[PDB]
Amino acid sequence: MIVKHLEEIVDTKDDIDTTTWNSRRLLLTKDGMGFSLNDTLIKAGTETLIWYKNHVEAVYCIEGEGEIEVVGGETYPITPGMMYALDGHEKHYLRARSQMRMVCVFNPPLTGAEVHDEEGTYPLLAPITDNWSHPQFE
Ligand SMILES: CC1=N[C@H](C(=O)O)CCN1
Ligand SMILES: [Fe+3]
């Protein structure tokens, strides 16, 4: 039996932060379920190109608005309750207008290595700057 909680996973090694998303890993390869499961926040304003050549992924949007454009296919608006699945290993752009909370399922499981690698993703547009700077720490 396995029990976890999002509020324990955030700000933790299972919460992987990138320029365009924040991925809270719920079931890992270690957990041995046959799939990985996470809760990903795609940040407002971002664009990411995505292509998983070695996995199929299901995505279920429970918050926010955006779209997914399939390279060589259609463009599908994302809203709460929309779900898409890349059974065809589709190359695609993922765009968030507001922050999107996505529940995600990978088959086979992603590994910590692939997540940290950012295997299959290419972030193209980051969120707008909050006036921050690396050499500024005031
Ligand atoms: C569609 C997507 N999957 C990744 C994941 O759930 O690991 C998060 C970033 N975006
Ligand atoms: Fe995706």
Author numbering: 1 to 138
Copy the relevant paper text.
While the EctA and EctB enzymes have amino acid sequence-related counterparts in various biochemical pathways in microorganisms, the ectoine synthase (EctC) is considered the diagnostic enzyme for ectoine production. Crystallographic analysis of the psychrophilic S. alaskensis EctC protein [(Sa)EctC] showed that ectoine synthase is a member of the cupin superfamily. By using an ectoine synthase from the thermo-tolerant bacterium P. lautus, we were able to obtain high-resolution crystal structures of the full-length EctC enzyme in complex with its iron-cofactor, its substrate, and its product. The (Pl)EctC protein is a head-to-tail dimer where backbone interactions between two ß-sheets mediate the contacts between the monomers in the dimer assembly.
We were able to obtain a (Pl)EctC crystal structure that contained both the iron ion and an ectoine molecule. After manual rebuilding and several cycles of refinement, the structure of the (Pl)EctC::Fe/ectoine complex was finalized with an R-factor of 18.2%, an Rfree of 24%, and a resolution of 2.5 Å. The ectoine molecule is coordinated within the active site of the (Pl)EctC enzyme through five direct interactions with the following residues: Ser-23, Asn-38, Tyr-52, Glu-57, and Phe-106. Ectoine exhibits a significantly different conformation to that of the bound N-γ-ADABA molecule. In particular, Tyr-52 and Glu-57 are no longer involved in any H-bonding interactions with N1 of ectoine (derived from the amidic N5 of N-γ-ADABA), but now both residues form H-bonds to N3 of ectoine, which is derived from the α-amino group of N-γ-ADABA. These new H-bonds towards N3 of ectoine also appear to be stronger than those formed originally with N-γ-ADABA, as suggested from their shorter distances (3.2 Å to Tyr-52, and 3.7 Å to Glu-57), and are further stabilized by an interaction with Phe-106. In addition, the side-chain of Asn-38 makes a direct contact to the carboxylate of ectoine, and this side chain is in turn held in place through stabilizing interactions with the side-chain of Ser-23. There may also be a direct interaction between the iron and the methyl group of the ectoine molecule. The side chain of Trp-21 adopts a single conformation in the (Pl)EctC::Fe-ectoine structure and thereby provides additional stabilizing contacts to the ectoine ligand (compare Fig. 6a,b). When the crystal structures of the (Pl)EctC::Fe/N-γ-ADABA and the (Pl)EctC::Fe/ectoine complexes are overlaid, it becomes apparent that the substrate (N-γ-ADABA) and the reaction product (ectoine) occupy almost the same position within the (Pl)EctC active site. Hence, the observed mode of ectoine binding indicates the requirement of an extensive conformational change of the linear N-γ-ADABA molecule during enzyme catalysis to yield the spatial position of the cyclic ectoine molecule.
